């Protein structure tokens, strides 16, 4: 395999095909699909890990959309990245203004 | 010997009518040099490249002041305070100043 | 025709104990796609600027620094560099 030779989980072979047929360029590099596969896998790992940690606090062993929402909106870099995107049925971070409290 | 606020109105309409750059060229010139130094040392800038920075900067600031003033008037005051600027950026979101 | 099975593999790496719902799986699947095209388009647009007809690891890396905000771009580059260098000898 190639993704296994790359030491990655995400399919370098499939990603290579998508960069080709996706009409981004005429000539796609050999290392390019490998590099992108490592970035996608990393970000996926970065999100999932924070999600699982947010799942352990909810006493749940299955990651639900709520867990993902809590994970993203509590990290500066992640929240900034996914700023324009809204997670379906993820809810909002519990925030109450100061002057609204007794 | 006019009135507190009369000259204020005079400078508004005279600058809105004009298209000239409101900040000095040379101080802004060296300002871009310093900021770029942190990312990479010994950089050169095209004469038009700096102008591109200056145009976008002023345009953004003017636009920001407009949203700021709207927040000020909304608070039943005519004087803009940092309290207004901060809120103006927050409502704008991330893309709108960060 | 998705990344469902791969995200699950990555999931077991960060957390072999926990699992993931189908709804959240779809979210993560939509995520990696939104990450794919965002970088791919930027990289394509990047090579077009330099009149180059080839997207390479160098373009993808530069795209990461442009898209990914601080501290995330650094680790993303490292993870990418580490991968490429492994497939350079093998």
């Amino acid at each position: 395999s190639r993704s296994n030779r790359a030491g990655l989980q995400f399919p370098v072979g499939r990603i290579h095909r998508l960069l080709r047929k996706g009409n981004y360029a005429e000539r796609v590099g050999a290392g390019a699909p490998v590099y992108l596969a490592a970035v996608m896998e990393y970000l996926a790992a970065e999100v999932l890990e924070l999600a699982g940690n947010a799942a352990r606090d909810n006493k749940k062993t299955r990651i639900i959309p709520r867990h993902l929402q809590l994970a993203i909106r509590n990290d500066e870099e992640l929240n900034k990245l996914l700023s324009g995107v809204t997670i379906a049925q993820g809810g909002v971070l519990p925030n109450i203004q100061a002057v609204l409290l007794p | 010997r006019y009135r507190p606020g009369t000259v204020a109105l005079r400078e508004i309409r005279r600058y809105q009518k004009s298209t000239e750059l409101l900040i000095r060229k040379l101080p802004f010139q060296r300002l871009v040099r310093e900021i770029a130094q942190d990312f990479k040392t010994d950089l050169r800038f095209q004469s038009s490249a700096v102008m591109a920075l200056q145009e976008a900067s002023e345009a953004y600031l003017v636009g920001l002041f407009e949203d700021t003033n709207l927040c000020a008037i909304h608070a039943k005051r005519v004087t803009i305070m940092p309290k207004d600027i901060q809120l103006a950026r927050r409502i704008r979101g991330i893309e709108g100043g960060l | 025709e998705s990344y469902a099975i791969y995200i699950y593999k990555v999931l077991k790496q960060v957390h072999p104990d926990t699992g993931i719902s189908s709804k959240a799986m779809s979210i993560m699947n939509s995520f990696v796609n939104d990450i794919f095209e965002r970088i791919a388009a930027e990289a394509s647009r990047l090579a077009h600027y330099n009149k180059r007809s080839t997207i390479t690891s160098r373009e993808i890396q530069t795209a990461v620094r442009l898209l990914l905000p601080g501290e995330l771009a650094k680790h993303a580059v490292s993870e990418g560099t580490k991968a490429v260098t492994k497939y350079t000898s093998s």
Binding site: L50, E76 | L87, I94 | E71, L72
Partner: peptide, 22 residues
């Protein structure tokens, strides 16, 4: 046998708050 970590913070705000430098 697990996965690594980086430097995470919080929403961290802006419009008045700090931005990160190194």
């Amino acid at each position: 046998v697990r996965r690594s970590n980086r430097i995470r913070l919080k929403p961290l705000e802006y419009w008045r708050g700090e931005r990160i430098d190194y």
